[PDB]
Ligand binder design. Structure first.
Ligand SMILES: CCc1cncnc1N1CCN(Cc2nc3cc(C(F)(F)F)ccc3[nH]2)CC1
Ligand SMILES: [Zn+2]
Length: 291
């Protein structure tokens, strides 16, 4: 019988229109002393909106059935009259965004590591019928060792929203596929575009299609006129060209091979997928050692 009173609030990890994420300590039971992350959703707001309700149930179901080392673990879920609670593993490594902002640009073997781990998470979600959509660096966390964790499966985390039918334009749209922005229907190919955009950001310091305003940023994304940096290896350039294509069906990973098709690319040739999945490959950055 898990109740709100079983946890002590330590601090706020995030705050949005739909609720808050806390670092908490369990103070009862066999996990006494153990640290978790706790998402607390405001029920009253969600219940009114039918698609907000659906999407909230969806996140629960998703994390309940997913189990993979590169995806965040859900431990408990419970409810009161006013609140919905998700108890997830606490990830002390911070957002991948922080590493990139620290470093400016990643070396290629640094990028390769993260992108490889992410590709295995995506392959797992794709086998389960799940589409991540947005691989902006703030949507990816690191655990205590420095390994990747995908975390963004729930409601829009933003404090103000764009429109009142979708939550597509509320955050940055710089890592999203053209077909998502056009709302013309899409599938898992959307994730491989986004991996390409993340990769481009890692290796050049900014996402591939940016404008001074949103309307121009959107136009740039739909146009999809890619600028490949000359200083990147031929392997990195070949992979970026195959991910960032306007024709979704023709992206690497779009076909039946999915992740295995991307994982076979020469850019990832030094990866042992057995060791990586087992988390035996040393990460490029150790959050524990970070001053
Ligand atoms: C929950 C997994 C996690 C594990 N360990 C440490 N940090 C974590 N999170 C990862 C997610 N992150 C971004 C974030 N998501 C949010 C969702 C909401 C919502 F309530 F949905 F409105 C509000 C603020 C939010 N901020 C905060 C820290
Ligand atoms: Zn929103």
């Amino acid at each position: 019988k898990i109740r709100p009173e079983c946890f002590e609030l330590l601090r706020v990890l995030g705050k949005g229109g739909y609720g808050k994420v806390f670092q908490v300590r369990k103070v009862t039971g066999a996990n006494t002393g153990k640290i978790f992350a706790m998402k607390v959703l405001k029920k009253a707001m969600i219940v009114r909106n039918a698609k907000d309700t659906a999407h909230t149930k969806a996140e629960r179901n998703i994390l309940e059935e997913v189990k993979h080392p590169f995806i965040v673990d859900l431990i408990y879920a419970f409810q009161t009259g006013g609140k919905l609670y998700l108890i997830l593993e606490y990830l002390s490594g911070g957002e991948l965004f922080m590493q990139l902002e620290r470093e400016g640009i990643f070396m290629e073997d640094t990028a390769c590591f993260y992108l490889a781990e992410i590709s295995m998470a995506l392959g797992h979600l794709h086998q389960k019928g799940i589409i991540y959509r947005d691989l902006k660096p703030e949507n990816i966390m690191l655990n205590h060792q420095g390994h990747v964790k995908l975390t963004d499966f729930g409601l829009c985390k933003e404090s103000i929203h764009d429109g009142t039918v979708t939550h597509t334009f509320c955050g940055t749209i710089e890592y999203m596929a053209p077909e998502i922005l056009m709302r013309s229907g899409h599938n898992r190919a959307v994730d491989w575009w986004s991996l390409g955009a993340l990769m481009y950001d890692m290796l050049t310091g900014a996402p591939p299609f940016t404008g001074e305003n949103r309307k121009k940023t959107i136009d740039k994304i739909l146009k999809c006129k890619l600028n490949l940096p000359p200083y990147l290896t031929q392997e990195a350039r070949d992979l970026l060209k195959k991910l960032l294509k306007r024709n979704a069906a023709s992206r690497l990973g779009a076909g039946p091979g999915d992740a295995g098709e991307v994982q076979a690319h020469p850019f990832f040739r030094h990866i042992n997928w057995e060791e990586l999945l087992a988390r035996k490959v040393e990460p490029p950055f150790k959050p524990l050692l970070q001053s």
